[PDB]
Write a structure and sequence with these properties.
This is part of a larger assembly, with chains A, B and C. Chain A is mainly α. Chain A contains 4 helices and 3 strands, in the order αβααββα. A 3-stranded antiparallel beta sheet of chain A has the order 1-3-2. By secondary structure, chain C is mostly helical. Chain C is built from 20 helices and 3 strands. Classes of the chains: A mainly alpha, B alpha+beta, C mainly alpha.
Amino acid sequence: HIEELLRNIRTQVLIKLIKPYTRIHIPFISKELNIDVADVESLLVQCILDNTIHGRIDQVNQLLELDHQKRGGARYTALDKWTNQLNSLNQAVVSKLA
Amino acid sequence: KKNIQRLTKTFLTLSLQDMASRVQLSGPQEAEKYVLHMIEDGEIFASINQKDGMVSFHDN
Amino acid sequence: YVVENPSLDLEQYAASYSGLMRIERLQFIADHCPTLRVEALKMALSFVQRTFNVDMYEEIHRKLSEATALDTAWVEATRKKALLKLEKLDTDLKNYKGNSIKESIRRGHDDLGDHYLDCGDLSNALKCYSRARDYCTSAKHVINMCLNVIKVSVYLQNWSHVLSYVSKAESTPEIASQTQAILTKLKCAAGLAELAARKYKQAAKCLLLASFDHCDFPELLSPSNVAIYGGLCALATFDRQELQRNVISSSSFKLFLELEPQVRDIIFKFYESKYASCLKMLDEMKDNLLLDMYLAPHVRTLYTQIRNRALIQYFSPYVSADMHRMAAAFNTTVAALEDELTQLILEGLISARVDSHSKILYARDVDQRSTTFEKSLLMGKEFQRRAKAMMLRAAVLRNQIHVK
């Protein structure tokens, strides 16, 4: 069961470390977690695929971009819904008889 | 023109030689002139780089 | 379906079953394995010599003769003495129904149906069992009759009727210690019917509830192929948030996965983002899988959906992926990967853009405000056009214009 350990603690450290960052370097995480680049990338991929870390990995520049964006534009989606409904009502009125 | 426009929904930078293989225009020069004509009419948003012979799609 | 030249053991595979079902599967092998014809047909003949086969026995016999005689004395034995046996059974069905004893009539119909199944006349046995239906007056009697009807209808290849009978058998005697053989039997039959009905998700959902200790039924399917079906269906139609709860952490399925290490390895490697090895072992398992009935038709689609799911899952955590590593991990060239990605993007599964100058797949972020404004403007223009159209219509429908 020691393999389950040395991974939960690393995950907790990674979550606690990348909280205030928006663009972090993967080698920095590798230095902090005392593991090589490949294991850090695998851990990040596994964490992201489990809907635990809100971020993405840029493989070209070896970067991790967090999600301190996407403000509350819920208004917009509401408008979209309205538009759809309006379109439907249109088909009801024009094609009633003539 | 429809095929060229559909190409812009998947590709961000396409070589002219590769481009004149899916739309079947048989020649990079003909593809270049078609893309230039399409740009002049505002149907597409693209730029031609003659150094590498590549078309880059902006879509902004 | 032909020219596959695979390798597969036939002794232990056929030894896991009993009755005419074995012969059926053997026939399927003879249809799909041109290299194993002689030995498979010889073993099928050896098995069928014990049974009461009449028409399909000569079928397989002349098929193997043409591929490369018959003990004609026991063929006469079959026809005349077995028709004497049929006369005896008919006679004692009349004898038993003369006293009108419900259990006696049920037993007579059951024996007649079993003999018809052994002789290949199960089509009439279905009508005999639907007749015996009227003589069932107990909960266990009904359960047994629906199990037998499902069994004989599996041989008929009518999956809708089998599913309807499974549903009515689960719903009639208020469903539910007692032996779980009946529950496992009905669940496995429903899963097979749904798999044959091009509904993989429901088959996987209703097949995962089996138990290894209660899986003792060498007449429909072995636990090995049950585990294979469950694993493949879960890997192809279950998302990541549902594969972990029911296929990974579910303790009931550990026994099945331990029985077949390879499918467990495939599932675990897919769950751990190891796609090269998973795809390689899938490719090497395809040859064996092509010889399974209730599977050979729907194999290509399953593999395609597994590969597409792997492609989406690989790119899910990335924002800019180099396609050289992507092609290396998927055991394919860059051009084939580019074509597959283009097809996926056109279909509408991955929102990404391909850059061929540096061979990089970039993620695409949609500007919500811009698309909202564009959609609203388009809807407004469409509504104005429709309004003017209808108003012209009202102008022309009021003056009585009808093209006489």
